[PDB]
Design a binder for this molecule. Structure first.
Ligand SMILES: [Mg+2]
Lengths: 279, 276
């Protein structure tokens, strides 16, 4: 429902997903914005999706909602059940995706990250925080971790990056753009709104831009084991990448199904790693 | 109504009309298109808005609809009343504004569709094309295509306040007023489909074009500036190279047609007598 979704469908159909994302990013500049963390139009209160054993000092997991226009509060439901009786799991909304008209978009990424940081610190109290994100969410998890450290004096205890494709490793994203766009339509529980598509464009552009800082927190890189689509071997490795991770785990599934069908394997890798970094 | 209209309204508020027009052009790439004149999804039969005397080889006027997303059927109504009893006046639709109409793949495809419709409506009568603003640029482009590709140069072209490439600084400086004019001129909410059409044509008209029509030109110029302009900046007026005749009429870019259409009609009528 809306012209942007119709255009997006056609762009994917015509194998021009990348080009269409640029248009979304450009158009998003004309959406009403918030320029300061306080001026955020949404309540960014994290939702507690799983509870750890009743039995202090233990790290809590914070799921950083990704940029997908078809996303929202359902994103971490399958994964989070695997944390029940193991770790608290808080899901934090991404500013710009809410309804109430529609949500204001952040003027810049740091503004959104500051809004999230304030909500997370409030909710987590004294517990160490481990940030977790998938795809776009993984890139956002790292960016938030750096902002927490540099602007809030509160570096996370760890970052879990599930299938990140950072700016230096974009070939699989380019080669699989059609499959990525199709995965977005396939994942719709309802038609992606024009407002949420514009949000997705705005964040994609944010995450392409100059982001100098590197978080001091240790990284768990979780990688899909199956290619999302056809890939010519001489291009190199299609797998997700992070520079200098603390630990690398491989799990079953592709970019999408690793979370859709194999979320227990992702949780298992996280739980093993958390135990290893804590004691 | 739609998200594009909402965004455009904000763009105009922020004085970024030009940037938004570029967004619309880029987005129009992802609308279904027609790639051959035959494949045009709409009937472009011109509409007769004014009737000349019964009384002959007298030229008929063909109004070339402009790109405004708020425009369409009403564009030439006020003007056309002044041709009643003087000249046949036909309005030709612009392809892509008509389930919504397929957009032309390129300008020549749209021009060919319009040419065909005009030639069958006009019969043996000579044709004088008339357009305002973007429509004036379109009138000239159609005239060239008629001559090049249809063996049928028009008898004349009337260009009402044209701002062609190389001479667009004033209309660019005044882009906020253009955008405000579109919202002020609304009879219904500008559809997202028509906004995309408007962007696509704006982009067509900024691109390199094949040549100049040999048809004589009447240049009709507004006498009052649409916005602020420093004297030392030079002439803000509409421009065409070496027109056959120039007429200056009261009003600005908009009001020359809004509340001085009789003056435009009078200039045209005088000119048609002279060239005939
Ligand atoms: Mg490396």
């Amino acid at each position: 429902a809306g012209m942007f979704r119709a255009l997006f469908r056609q762009a994917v159909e015509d194998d021009r997903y990348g080009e269409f994302l640029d248009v979304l990013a450009e158009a998003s500049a004309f959406r009403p914005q918030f320029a300061s963390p306080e001026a955020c139009s949404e309540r960014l209160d994290p939702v507690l999706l799983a509870g750890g054993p009743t039995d202090e000092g233990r790290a809590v997991l914070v799921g950083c909602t990704g940029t997908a226009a078809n996303g929202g509060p359902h994103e971490f439901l399958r994964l989070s059940t695997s944390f029940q009786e193991e770790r608290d799991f808080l899901a934090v909304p991404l500013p710009g995706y809410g309804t109430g008209g529609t949500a204001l978009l952040p003027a810049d990424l740091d503004t959104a990250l500051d809004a999230q940081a304030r909500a997370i610190l409030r909710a987590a109290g004294d517990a160490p925080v481990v940030l977790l994100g998938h795809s776009g969410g993984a890139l956002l998890a790292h960016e938030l971790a750096f902002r927490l450290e540099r602007a809030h004096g509160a570096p996370p205890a760890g970052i879990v990056l599930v299938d990140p494709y950072p700016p230096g490793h974009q070939e699989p994203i380019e080669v699989w753009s059609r499959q990525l766009g199709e995965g977005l339509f396939a994942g719709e529980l309802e038609p992606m709104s024009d407002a949420r598509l514009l949000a997705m464009g705005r964040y994609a552009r944010f995450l392409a831009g100059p982001r100098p800082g590197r978080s001091s927190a240790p990284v768990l890189l979780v990688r899909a084991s199956e290619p999302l689509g056809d890939w010519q071997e001489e291009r190199g490795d299609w797998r997700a990448h992070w520079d200098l991770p603390h630990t690398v785990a491989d799990v079953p599934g592709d970019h999408f199904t690793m979370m859709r069908d194999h979320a227990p394997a992702v949780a298992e890798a996280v739980l093993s790693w958390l135990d290893a970094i804590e004691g």
